[PDB]
Design a protein around this ligand. Sequence first.
Ligand SMILES: Nc1ncnc2c1ncn2[C@@H]1O[C@H](COP(=O)(O)OP(=O)(O)OP(=O)(O)O)[C@@H](O)[C@H]1O
Ligand SMILES: CC(C)C[C@H](N)CO
Ligand SMILES: [Mg+2]
Ligand SMILES: [Mg+2]
Ligand SMILES: [Zn+2]
Length: 867
Amino acid sequence: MQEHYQPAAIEPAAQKKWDDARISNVSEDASKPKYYCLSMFPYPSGKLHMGHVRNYTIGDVLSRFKLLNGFNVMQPMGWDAFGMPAENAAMKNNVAPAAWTYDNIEYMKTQLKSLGFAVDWEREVATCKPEYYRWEQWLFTKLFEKGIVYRKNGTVNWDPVDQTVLANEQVIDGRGWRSGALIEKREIPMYYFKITDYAEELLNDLDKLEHWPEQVKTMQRNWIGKSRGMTVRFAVSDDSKQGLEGDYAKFLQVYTTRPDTLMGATYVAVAAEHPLATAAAADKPELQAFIAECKATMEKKGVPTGRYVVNPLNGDKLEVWIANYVLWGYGDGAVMAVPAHDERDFEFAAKYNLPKKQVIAVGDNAFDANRWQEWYGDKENGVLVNSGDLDGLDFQTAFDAVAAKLQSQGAGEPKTQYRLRDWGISRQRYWGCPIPIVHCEKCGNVPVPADQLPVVLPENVVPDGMGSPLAKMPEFYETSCPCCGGAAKRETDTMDTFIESSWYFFRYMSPKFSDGMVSAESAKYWGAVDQYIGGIEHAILHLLYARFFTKLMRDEGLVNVDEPFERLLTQGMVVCETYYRENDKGGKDWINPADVELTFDDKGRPVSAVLKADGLPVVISGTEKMSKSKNNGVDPQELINAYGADTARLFMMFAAPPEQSLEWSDSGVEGAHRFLRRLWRTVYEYLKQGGAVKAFAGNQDGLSKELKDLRHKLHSTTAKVSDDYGRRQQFNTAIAAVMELLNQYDKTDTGSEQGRAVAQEVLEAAVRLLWPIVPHICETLWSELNGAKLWEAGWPTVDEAALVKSEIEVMVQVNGKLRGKITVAADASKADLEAAALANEGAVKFMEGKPAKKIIVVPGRLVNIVV
Ligand SMILES: Nc1ncnc2c1ncn2[C@@H]1O[C@H](COP(=O)(O)OP(=O)(O)OP(=O)(O)O)[C@@H](O)[C@H]1O
Ligand SMILES: CC(C)C[C@H](N)CO
Ligand SMILES: [Mg+2]
Ligand SMILES: [Mg+2]
Ligand SMILES: [Zn+2]
């Protein structure tokens, strides 16, 4: 063994030994329980940075832990290679998208291999390859023919800077997820996935996810936004049928989410386009004035109609009103009004002097007609009043009673709605999966036959920056219709990158399977992802899509699971300084801190910052998430070349609990390296003074107290590291525990024959406990300590015999008559026995109150309080 810790020697040798052994290349092996641990794969949008090191070291710790415990561990890596992140990076570096993406992939792969992650590289997947994206084109055609995928014109989200439509989930704070530019509305046709068909299932299955952070589930519940409401029909009065447009002559249909207040409806409002407004204007020019004027912030306008509808629950005749807030296209284009318990209704009926009937009571609070209070709208603690046989019911009981009422009369029925909208996936972008549709002017939009898939995206295209490039390539889009054989045009829009991100975890199970998305036998074997690791930014963007896709694929018979990810760890962000300049196109040019010289004030505040290459200023933007797209990352390859990969991994797990934000610091890097030197030095000086021996094991009677205490600390540590990896998933406290063990070891004289045997046991355990975190140095130290393979020695076990404290039971006497019994320490002095003997209730009671006249102490045998 060399004295000095030289990572450039040992890290390549250790990786080659692991590679030759093929311990990460796994099969569908029924003789070992499976463990599928997966980190969210990266966009090829730049170089990986230390934030990725944190993300992928967490996965590697968990994978290597499970490997040492006998699991068949699959930890795959691949490349989220299609769509905006890779294509925008290509254009910003003046590179064609294909050539940029495959070169960036090769660099990212080198970075990850340098870090020694136990990755099955034979399952590597690149989503921009036809052997991958042909299968999402297949699913698309399958879903398109069932109507689960459809094309429709509509009002869509338009990004003027990325020059593409975007899905609702890609609109962040009204800005595009990659551009940060303000989104505009446009009428553009799009292909949609009918995710609202699965809205109930996506919502309710959240209850199954017991090992997901509650925050992710809360945000998906709010994004789905399920509303339980009631359709309610008010029959049109006999006096008000002038204009019989079918059922618009019989009744007026509304929707409401407060049917518990239906007894409180004092009028009804209707849209200017609704037939009620049409009939009540045939002889009303001041009605068509409102109709033309109208045809959440605008203050409400309204006009009475003179037509009347009937409350089905009590028979009250309510006047219909033309309203500015009712929009045809949202449901039946008509609403009811309960001014006493809805703020929007209270203000309208205050402006137009319309009655307000109190119908909900909330405990001690008194009602005030001309003065709204927030308790008027409590949907939790209220109780119904003035409501016939509904009196006394709370919201949830009254909801069901109203439904029973309305249904017996045929005048209503419950109806669910959701804020969730269907998923718009087509993009006016080149670098993405082609949409397998052909437009024939006779047959319509026809899917491409399965036998003709994939539609191969041409790869030698350089986007000019002016709209969809495929729209400009008739060598691509001119074709013949697959049903009639005549002239036709391919769809030139492509699929958003979140199509590929929505099923890659299944493709990893059989990445070379050429007859489907995923082979049946591997899908049955791997089941779901046991452990998933990625940032909280994916809570709605991707994690919702992935669950939807899983359910789509299950219903098509491709997989047999309801959810893709059983456990989810959302690691905290590595954050660091950020800088940029505004460019001529109004967009920021981000600049790496390594290229910035700063100027400070007397207190230490950075006041100025300049680019070192041109001496000209840059903007100090503040600490921020380490981001490829913000050019603020610290490249792991830089740390590896200076300090070793182990130092890089160790710093990221030690600096903070995994969910806590981690500020970058050079001091932390140095502290991690000194610990690795200490571990190297500790093993080196153990072996320099006698060489390895057989590790202590078995019964420890006859060991000195000092060596017993150390074995107690050793097996306590094993117990704690085990709990930290397997139950708590807290890696910093695992490292801290091992440091404490090494601290006690440094203070224990292990020079003796039994001493060296306990030293070997301590060091054999420590390097295994740390192997998931810093596997390179631990593989090298273990092979200097022990001739066997490390991954075959397995996870260290807890010797429970080493945990029993070393005690002793002394008998106490009074007058000589045995009067009690106490336990004390084995190393206890004569006085502590004397103090403990008097603390015995027995001796206290037998001695009465007399002071002791003497106390005879038999060494480790008896105490005689002569009272
Ligand atoms: N600063 C960071 N700290 C921890 N994890 C991070 C950090 N940045 C990214 N990740 C994680 O790395 C994984 C890969 O993400 P991604 O490829 O988007 O990297 P990125 O740095 O965010 O790039 P981009 O800026 O282009 O979005 C994700 O799971 C993401 O949460
Ligand atoms: C699973 C994927 C959506 C992850 C992205 N490539 C990184 O944010
Ligand atoms: Mg369960
Ligand atoms: Mg990102
Ligand atoms: Zn045709």
